[PDB]
Amino acid sequence: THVQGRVYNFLERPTGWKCFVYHFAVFLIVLVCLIFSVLSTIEQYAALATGTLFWMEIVLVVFFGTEYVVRLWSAGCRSKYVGLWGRLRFARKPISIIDLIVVVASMVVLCVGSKATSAIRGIRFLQILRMLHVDRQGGTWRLLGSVVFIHRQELITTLYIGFLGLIFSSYFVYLAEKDAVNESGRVEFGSYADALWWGVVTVTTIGYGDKVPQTWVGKTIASCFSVFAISFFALPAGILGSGFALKVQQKQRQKHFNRQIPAAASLIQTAWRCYAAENPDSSTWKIYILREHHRATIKVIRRMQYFVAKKKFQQARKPYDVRDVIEQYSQGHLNLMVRIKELQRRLD
Amino acid sequence: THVQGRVYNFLERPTGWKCFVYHFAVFLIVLVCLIFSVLSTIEQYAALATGTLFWMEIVLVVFFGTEYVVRLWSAGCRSKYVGLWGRLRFARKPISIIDLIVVVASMVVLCVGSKATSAIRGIRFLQILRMLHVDRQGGTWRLLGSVVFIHRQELITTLYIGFLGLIFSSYFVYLAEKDAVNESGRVEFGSYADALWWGVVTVTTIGYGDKVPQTWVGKTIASCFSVFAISFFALPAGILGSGFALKVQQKQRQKHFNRQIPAAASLIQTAWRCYAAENPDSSTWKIYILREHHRATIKVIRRMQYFVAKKKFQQARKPYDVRDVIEQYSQGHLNLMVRIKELQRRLD
Amino acid sequence: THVQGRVYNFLERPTGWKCFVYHFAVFLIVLVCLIFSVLSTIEQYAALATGTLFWMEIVLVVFFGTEYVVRLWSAGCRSKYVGLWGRLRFARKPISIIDLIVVVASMVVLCVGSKATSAIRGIRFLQILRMLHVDRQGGTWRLLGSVVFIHRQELITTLYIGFLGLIFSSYFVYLAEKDAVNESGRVEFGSYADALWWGVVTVTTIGYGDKVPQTWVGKTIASCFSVFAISFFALPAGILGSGFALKVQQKQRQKHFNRQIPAAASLIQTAWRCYAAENPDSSTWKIYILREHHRATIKVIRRMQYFVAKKKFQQARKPYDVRDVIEQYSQGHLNLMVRIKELQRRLD
Amino acid sequence: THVQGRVYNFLERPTGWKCFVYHFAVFLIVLVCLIFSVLSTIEQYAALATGTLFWMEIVLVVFFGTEYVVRLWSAGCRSKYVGLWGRLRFARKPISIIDLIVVVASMVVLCVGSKATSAIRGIRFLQILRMLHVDRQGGTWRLLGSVVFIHRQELITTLYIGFLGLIFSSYFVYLAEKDAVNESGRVEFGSYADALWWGVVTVTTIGYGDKVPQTWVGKTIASCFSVFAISFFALPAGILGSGFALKVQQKQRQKHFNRQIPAAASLIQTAWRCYAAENPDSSTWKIYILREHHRATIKVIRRMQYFVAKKKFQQARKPYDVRDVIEQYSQGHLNLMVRIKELQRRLD
Amino acid sequence: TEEQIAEFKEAFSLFDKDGDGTITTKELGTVMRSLGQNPTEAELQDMINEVDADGNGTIDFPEFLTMMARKMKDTDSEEEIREAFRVFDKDGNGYISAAELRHVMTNLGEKLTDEEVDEMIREADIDGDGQVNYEEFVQMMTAK
Amino acid sequence: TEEQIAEFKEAFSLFDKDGDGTITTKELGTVMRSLGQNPTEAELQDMINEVDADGNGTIDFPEFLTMMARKMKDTDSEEEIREAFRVFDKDGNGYISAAELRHVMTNLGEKLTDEEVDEMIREADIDGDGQVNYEEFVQMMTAK
Amino acid sequence: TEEQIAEFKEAFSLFDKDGDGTITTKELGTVMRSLGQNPTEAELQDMINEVDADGNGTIDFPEFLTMMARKMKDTDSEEEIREAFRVFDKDGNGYISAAELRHVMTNLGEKLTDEEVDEMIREADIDGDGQVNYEEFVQMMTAK
Amino acid sequence: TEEQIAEFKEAFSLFDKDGDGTITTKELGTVMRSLGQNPTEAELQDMINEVDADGNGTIDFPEFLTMMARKMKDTDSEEEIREAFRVFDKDGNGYISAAELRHVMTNLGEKLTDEEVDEMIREADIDGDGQVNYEEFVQMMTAK
Known part of the structure; x- marks a missing residue:
């Protein structure tokens, strides 16, 4: 199970010189594919060409069908798609449709289109559709869409x-x-x-x-x-x-943020405790040491603290702001004047 | 009255898939208009064309005259233009002139230009002028003008x-x-x-x-x-x-601002109270509980507070600034040193 | 003297619809100049043209010579250039050279070039050189140069x-x-x-x-x-x-700055007082109420305060900065802990 | 030794009108080179041309070989490359390879290519390669690479x-x-x-x-x-x-930073002291005035302070941030409430 | 304007109460406390910083006359108040509810006397579904 | 909803303890101190600022009912908690270790009772190498 | 420069009053209080931070000589003062009113002695409609 | 590493002085005061915040071992110190003066004992016009 996880990570979010290079390499291979396929119309070499080309196309589509399926089963680490129905949903992703269509198209057109006009008119379509996978990362696409939408x-x-x-x-x-x-x-x-x-x-x-x-x-x-x-x-x-x-x-x-950690821990434990509240017999009562009215009010205060942590955490992700400064300063100043009245009064 | 308000809102500031789509739809219809009108010069189909085209043009101009007038009467919710003279002023807006001219031009040229060179030389002018309404929102136009002017x-x-x-x-x-x-x-x-x-x-x-x-x-x-x-x-x-x-x-x-609310309430009530002051018999005196000199000084203090709220509110709209921070901090510090002298002195 | 000042201001830094429009108007006139001068090669109208064109050119150059000189004498309000030598230095400005050359070129070439190939080859040069003055404001040119240099x-x-x-x-x-x-x-x-x-x-x-x-x-x-x-x-x-x-x-x-005012007043009075110091008999001694050693030390302290105001004023022009905040806050905090030791001690 | 240092500085990081101008001058000379070399194909002057051109090329390559070597030996001020092996490493820099190849290419092709098709096909290559040195500063190239990489x-x-x-x-x-x-x-x-x-x-x-x-x-x-x-x-x-x-x-x-200085001094002295610690007999003990256990704990505290200064210094280079403000303010406030409990307590 | 400046010197004398010609934060605070108001010190400083143009911290008589000269029935102040009404305006049509305005005027900010609000509500034509055109209020209170 | 608002008025009466209709920071602090909690004042202010929508600083009963109405089993709150789980998730696969969660829940933030954590751990299927799918927790505690 | 540095050591000895070689905020405050000035502590710190280049908070003698060396009759300081005059300049022509300058010098900032202003006004050619070319002042007080 | 962690537990016991396993700001301040140092509280907090990774404010023993594990003879720390030397470097050639370094080490920051500086100077080959290659110092003190 660990190996599949490493393999999926290697394919999806890979780094280091070998991995990116691996993909670069397959890009050199598809280059040789195009070189020979276009050299096939040159008669001095059409003999060598006719041998290495009909071969090459199938070599590609086979290899790709394999890597695809390898990817799809090894993709079980993501809890969404772990399990059977999980892979089915997993297939629901776009790029899944993408490589699916590429490989199946090449499959059908090289199974029947071999022995034919629109077949070759499609084979160029395939040489096109196969290069789509060279980027493969999806996070920033959102960035683009964002800026546009703004x-x-x-x-x-x-x-x-x-x-x-x-x-x-x-x-x-x-x-x-x-x-x-x-x-x-x-x-x-x-x-x-x-x-x-x-x-x-x-x-x-x-x-x-x-x-x-x-x-x-x-x-x-x-x-x-x-x-x-x-x-x-x-x-x-x-x-x-x-x-x-x-x-x-x-x-x-x-990039710099860290306050997320304790805010997270809090928010988590708040929410769990809240849920655990619905059980009157739960262990959360061990906090308080019969409870005829304290139950409801407790639920209140618990939800309250929960909301606090929730919002605050959202803030635990957003950059600091003159707002924060102004607020907290004013507050501390307020607390201070309070303590001044406290000692003024004490002297009274 | 409520329905007209909803209708005007629907036409002017609409959202949801149906409304924007509605306009999209009318844009598909004017497309079909152009398709048939340009197909009218194709002889294989000039028979069908001559039937659907002379019709289509009038269908458009009629429908548009209607939607226009519907808009203009339903536009009574805006207090500026509620009432008769209100609609007249309302007409004073540019886009009013726009759709006015479009529909009246189509009207006159299809009433007299039917049975003729500059008539068609104008009919293209009309196909042009009719598409102007596709955006219809005015707030950001100001944004453009602003940036340019800057x-x-x-x-x-x-x-x-x-x-x-x-x-x-x-x-x-x-x-x-x-x-x-x-x-x-x-x-x-x-x-x-x-x-x-x-x-x-x-x-x-x-x-x-x-x-x-x-x-x-x-x-x-x-x-x-x-x-x-x-x-x-x-x-x-x-x-x-x-x-x-x-x-x-x-x-x-x-986007985030909220301080506008209480500042608004204040500014409002200040100004109203100020106006209410001019009546010596008004109820604002119930605050103070014969008033030979307190009247004028009261007017002063009232105007003062008014100005405060006014400016402050303008600020209640503008983003925070290192200015605000510096000021308020220095102040709080000042108040603080004051209170220190207060307790130093008390010990005296 | 007041009128010349208004006139110079009107010509140099004018605002309102008439002034900018005035210049716009002279730009319409030079347009008519070009219209007739180029119509001079059209034979149906070369009769009217030959009459209004030889005239027009001289009308222009005369008017411009006038406005120029009017400008130069009325420009006496600026203390740099008030007075004779002042105008001479004033002439030292670029645009002075500009309109100088334009008018003198038109002068010589229409005095001798009238009765001739390079003369007309220069007359186009003149129609070009005359339009240079349409902007006339110099402050922002610096802005451009700045950004480039950066x-x-x-x-x-x-x-x-x-x-x-x-x-x-x-x-x-x-x-x-x-x-x-x-x-x-x-x-x-x-x-x-x-x-x-x-x-x-x-x-x-x-x-x-x-x-x-x-x-x-x-x-x-x-x-x-x-x-x-x-x-x-x-x-x-x-x-x-x-x-x-x-x-x-x-x-x-x-745009918002105001702190410049008192800082200015200070810096001014500091520097003047410093200069006034060099006179041991000056009135600045009336501050202190024989002075065998206090003189030198006084010069010190005076220069010190001067430098303070100087730098500080430079700051009185620059936008606020987290630097300022951090500094002044830390200071006030320091003063505060000082006062705490003051009352702690007092209790001792 | 001082003169070589000045000379290297003059060549590498020169400023003032003469230096930049010097390079400008050599750029005018290479211009004359191109003028005569291309005039060599004009027969009215091919006599003068054939005399000044074969000469000019060698004049250039000789002068450049000289300035190059002058540069390389005078470059001994940089401690990396001071000494023999130092110059060898120094040669490891790119622009060293650059001028090396330019001069050696011109050398070989004008030693053998004189008496020949690819020789001239290379001589244009040389006229190209010689102009590469006109910028010569390397710091900002990094800036470019940075932004791209980002x-x-x-x-x-x-x-x-x-x-x-x-x-x-x-x-x-x-x-x-x-x-x-x-x-x-x-x-x-x-x-x-x-x-x-x-x-x-x-x-x-x-x-x-x-x-x-x-x-x-x-x-x-x-x-x-x-x-x-x-x-x-x-x-x-x-x-x-x-x-x-x-x-x-x-x-x-x-540009404005200054806090770097004392932070630097600290960090330095910390690290040196830490190293000096490894000697139990060093003089750093003179701080404390047998030391059976104090040694190790001392090493701890010393390393600690070292890390503090290290990080802090890194900060002593980075612009101020609302982070810094928020932190230090909160802290000072905290210390303050501490001192309040201190005097509250004292009154107890 | 001589009766106007006579009244303004009369009112300035009510603040001055000596021959200074300046008004201090204390010199206004005692006047406000004689009305039973108890303002804060920073309230008085925010009040006073809106009047002076010299930065010294007191209100001279020309500052008093510049404040008393300039008009509330203004081009900008009407638009400021109109923009201030729009916070409490749903759908932005130019109408607010009567009970919404009573809830706001007696709760938010400076809470109004119910008799004040009972006058304020009945100052405008309130019926017609309970909606009120606040530009009618603005024209009223910008009639000066 | 009449039994719901009956219970909400019952619970509001436990905070009110008089006929105000508002809840103060003191009026909540005494209730929390009656449970032996000792909250801070700024803790109570942060608690109270999440309930009111009037800005006055106390919780009226409609603010109480708007808080008690709106649902934890939400579209956004589930995603917030799911994003909160991912800080402690190595490799981001949807699994965290059991002992990592016990070390976090009993140390970080509000430190949990070990009996609480012993219930919390055994709420999910924990075996299979010790990894646990936290979306199982989220579906559980978003079942409401 | 040996008589110059003799005078500068003489003046440094008037501040030092011991064998430290450094000048403290106290060590300057007592000197200023001996003149009857009563400066603030932050005033003294702002004064002292303009002299040292070591950051330690006291003025050594080389800092004293670097301050006393560098010249007021400068390229930049003249332009700073000239930019400082332009705040009080209407129309920017290079002329300010006499009574405007008397109102500013005796009210704004450090308020001047009327005898000081009576000397300051008569230092420049004031007639010609009452306007004065302040660059005449700047050339005068930058004559050093 | 068992003798290493034996020594690190031995040194941790010198700070702990009880069975806590954590080190407080007080628990370090008493140790530093037993050496006659008198550190500030914020100095101790800045010291302690560079060791922990739990945010709790004390140094556990694994935090102690992570601090004691990681090496001064580093790729980054050498470059940090080398960038730190360049502030006092005129012309940036890799050489600083001997007396400049003595003036800096005994005045700026933590002022060094003159015997410390007399050792520090003689640690490097100082002659050759008095210049010293500070990368020789860095290789020396990054020899660890």
Whole structure:
């Protein structure tokens, strides 16, 4: 059981030079796969090629089917998925669907597609789908989704405006140039849709050069609109950039936390004790040493302390704040003035 | 009255899957509108098309006129616009003008433009103007305007410099290349205006490819100028990006505030009491238990407390600051040394 | 004298709609200037044009000479430049040189260049040089220079690397493609310099399209190098963007300061008193109420307090810091424990 | 010995106008080198050129060999590399390898390559390799590497996704357009690899214009994919930009530190004393004034204090934190309540 | 404004009670204690720091006249009070409940006299489902 | 819910002990001291600030019923406790050692009675190498 | 500089009053109290922290000579004082009013003796509408 | 390691002086005062917080053995001390003056006995212009 745990850890959250390198190695092998498969259309070597290629494809799909299943059974350490139904639920994860489809597709298409047009049109699909697994870690994907969800408003707005102005400037241009004829004899801006394409090609700094306005009015609008809205278009890149760099910075601060430990122990023991309360015969009474009314009030105080620890723990995870400082200082000061009245009074 | 309030809320500030989806749905319908209207120029189907299109346009404009008016009468919950004159003022809002014009334009042009060149040249204008409503929320627009207004200086400067350098480098280039002839027999850089266009096309990383310098002197200036000023040109994108991400971060901090509540209650009651003061016969005197001079001084102290609460409340909205900490700590320390002299003295 | 002060302020640091608008207006006038001057080459109207243009140019240069000199004499409020030599030094400013050259150039070239090739080749130079004054404020230019100077290191590095990689990838490409012939019959990559140009055109996302590699080896290097180093190339835009947004944020915090006032008053009076000390007969002795040794020690203590106020004032300008908090708190705590020993002892 | 130290400092970490200028000067000289070497292919001047060029190259390589060796022997001030073996290790540095190879390459190729194809194909390599030394400072390179290493995750992810989407959209396009024929008679999208190239050319806003889709389906995919993923592609520029600007800001805060001094002195003397402890006969016993058991316990307490100073010093380098504030305040408050019980008790 | 500044000097004399021309925290605390109020010292310091512009810690007579000059019926102060009403406003429509306002005014902050609240409630048109337009209150108490 | 609110008024009467309707820090401290607990004052203030929603500093009966209404067997509270278990979890697989849990429960935080821990350990299936699935505990103590 | 350091040792001996070579906060407070000044302890600590560079809390004689060496007529100190004048400068033209300066010097901060201000005002050319160029003061008091 | 842990239990018994197994701030302060040291209480708390890993505030014997196990002759501690030497290093070449080190060791921080410094100086090869390679000291005192 220990070995499966090590193996699953090795596959899922591996570190050290050999492990990452192992994956790198399998990436070199799939490279050789592509080299030979594309060399198969070169006739000087199509003899060697036809031998090593039909082989190679099956070698891959077999090996991958194996590593997959190895992974799935060794994945029993996670309590969610330990056990049979556990693996079934485990399969519920996305990347499970991913490698599942990759291997089964390769399976069916190399079992029947061997002896056939859409078969090869699918075999390229497979060479594509197989490389998906190279990252394999899932925690930070959430980070991305987070930042996006936070800034959804701006992005939405910017996109709206830019796309819009595209639309408009396109209209004016189309009306401006729908009469000119290219020097090569044709008319560039046939319909509004042409100009629209041209626009979007422009506004994003691509500049194909297939469609260019002729009359100074056109060049004018192009210039103004481009120079203006282009910056709006490139904003989400800048935004997200700064977003990540910021959030990263804060996380890098969060690394330091320790207060989580005792808060955790507390919260735990509180909640367990609370549950244990529901048994009037439990041992928690040994604290107090018949109890006609003390029961209910006890439940109260216990729940109270529980809530305290709960919230406080949530705080035991969040960075310190001028809030905390202000609060605790004011409090300590208060307690202090209290003690002053205590000794003033004592002197009374 | 309650139902209109719910309906207005549903239209203006809606949430949940059905509402946003409702709008999404109307967006799919206007899609079908465009599909059929553009299919109307395809002759295999122009028979079906001519039937569903003349219909569709009117279906839209009718439905929209309805939803608009529904909105406007149900919008009576906002006290500003409750009542007749209230709706009239309500109409004073921009988006009111927006949907007003859209629907009335469609109205007139489909009442008279049916049986006609500028009519269709307007019908495209309408297909454009109708999609404007897809966002519909106004709070954050202010955010945008804010950030711009804050950074107006930089943007202005950067734009100035880049545009300028464009001008100059254009001059030198024009003088450099106004003699060369393209290999296709023409002369690219006819006048300075040509080179200017070329410049602006370049400096913004479009690169159409219609106009390219020939002599190494030209290529030189192009290279230097481009590589240098281009970064300046793309700066406002980066700036605004970081601006939003920052301001967003701070707002995200502001979310937590609670001290606003009692400060509000105070400020309120202060101001009301102050107003109530102007009545010498009011009940506020019941506080004090004939009052020949206490009246004026009372007005003073009341106004004072009012100002306190006012400012303080404004603070009850702004994030904590090392300022607050320093101040309150120093104060508490001061009070403390006071109390020390109090007990030192008592021992005297 | 008061009017000149108002006028200088109006010209230099003006606000309100009329002033900025005034400048806007003169900008519309110079627009009409350009309109007529370029319409002068249109023969249908060259008659009207030849009348309003030769006039217009002189109208401008005359008006500008006037406003300039008006500015220079009214600029006497600034104590640096009040007086004759003051204006002479005042002239020492850059923008003084600027408008000086603009007006004198227009003067000489329209006095002699009227009745001539390089004259018009200069007249375009003038239309250019005249628009320089549209911003006119100098404080923030420093801001720009600051941020640059701060980040000089990074920029320098990034530029180095990108330019470098350009160089290298260019070499490999040149060797890759110096043999191919374009489909149009020519050879694109004649010499290494060609490829170099092509490179720099590429690496900055321009994409003219005049020079494109042919052999898959070339396309390969282009792809890799582009996709990689391009981001490095656009970094200074992003950097400076975030730089400004940050520095702006901090400044926006700094707005609040008030402690500067008393610190200023102190520092002032300290320094004056110190200077007044050097007179043994001065009135500062009236503080102390023959003084054989108290003189020197007094000078000491006075200088001391002076330094205190000086530094402290510099701080009276800088935002609060956890440093300040920590320090002053620790101190107050110390004083406190002192007072505790004071009352402990008193009880002794 | 003092002079070598000054010379090494002058070469390695020089400041003032002459030093940086000196290097600037040698950069002007290598410019003249390139001018004459490229003028050597101009026949009007090939006579003067052939005289000054064969000379110039050797002048350079000789001078550089000298400055190099001068540097290497004068570099004895650094204790690591003082002494013979020290210089040998010193050579172990990268830039040592750099200038080593540059000078030896020029040496061999101008000793044998004089009287020859790959010789000149190498001489360009040399003109390239010689300019590498223009920056020469190494501290901040670490900064770069740092920031990259911090953000490796995001960059990796973004790159993954963008490159990927490229792949996919390429597939769909290839299938879309592999049948069309350019108006010039050819078929642009011959194979999938063509479209792939086109893609990558597009997605990075280059826009060569050699390959452009024809069918509206193609233009569609191009538009959508471009406009969407392009922002992802340019993100690392933005990210790193903000990263540097941030880290720079914090460093700029760190400049102020002073507490390092006494903490250092302490940590030093602690550790030395600890080592000196291992000698029972050392003088550290003079502190205490036979010592059968006090020895071991002393070692304990000494090590303890050592660790304290060690950690604390590490802190003596890190910026202040709300952590520090909270801690020390709470402590002082605690000590205070202690002293309150002390005087409460005293009154008992 | 001479009757205004006559009244303001009259009121300043009620605080001064000598020939200083300045008002101390004590010099206001005794006046407030003569009304049976018992304010805190930091309450008085927060009160006094909103009046002076010299930083010295006392209120001179020009500070008194600048405070007494400037108007409550303001552009900003009306919007501040309107933003202050919105904390207790559900759905943000411009209406708050009557009993919610009575529960707030007699409990939160400075607790009001029930006779004060009975006047305050009946100052506005309260019926129509019990909702009240607080901008009617704001126009009333910004009528000055 | 009338028997529920009958029991909640019964329990509120055990804290009130007069006709106030509010519970003070003293009014809870005497109850806790009658059990032999000796809590701190700031402990009581942290306890009381988690119940009220009026900010006044005492617990009214509706605050008591809102506290007593809302459920421990929650969506969030289960995940909070599950995140709390993971501090003491090596390798994060969902298993902690038995003696590690006994060392933690009797030493860290509030130290448990050994009889409490002897019940707590035997509440879950402990064998199988000594590892225990703490989500079994969470389902147990979130069964409510 | 031997007469300079002779005078500086003479002045150091007036603070030392024993053979320590260091100056304590007490050792300066007694000197200041012998002049009838009554400084605070934190005032003395702020005074002393501007002189030492060893952090020990006393002023050695080399710290005394480094303080007494370095010059008030400086590049930076002139600009600091010039920036300090600009707080009281309306319109920033380089001129402040005479009575504004008398109101500031006798009220704000350390309040000046009226004879001191009567000398200070007449140190500069004051007429010409009552405005004074404070850079004339700065050149005067930076003449050293 | 049994003689090592025998010596560590022997040394732990010198601090324990009863059968607790924990070391208190008092329990260390009396030991330090028996040597004539007079440490502060916060000094003892800073001393003790560097040893425990349980947060309870006393040093158990396994905490004692973890402290006594881990080595001064370390990868990091050598670099920390080397970075600590560089504050007093002008030009950063790897050499400090002899009299600068004597002035620092006898004045700054904990002031050294002159006999201690006379041993410390002569521990390294000091001649050659008076400069000393402090990495020679670090290799010496990291020889353990």
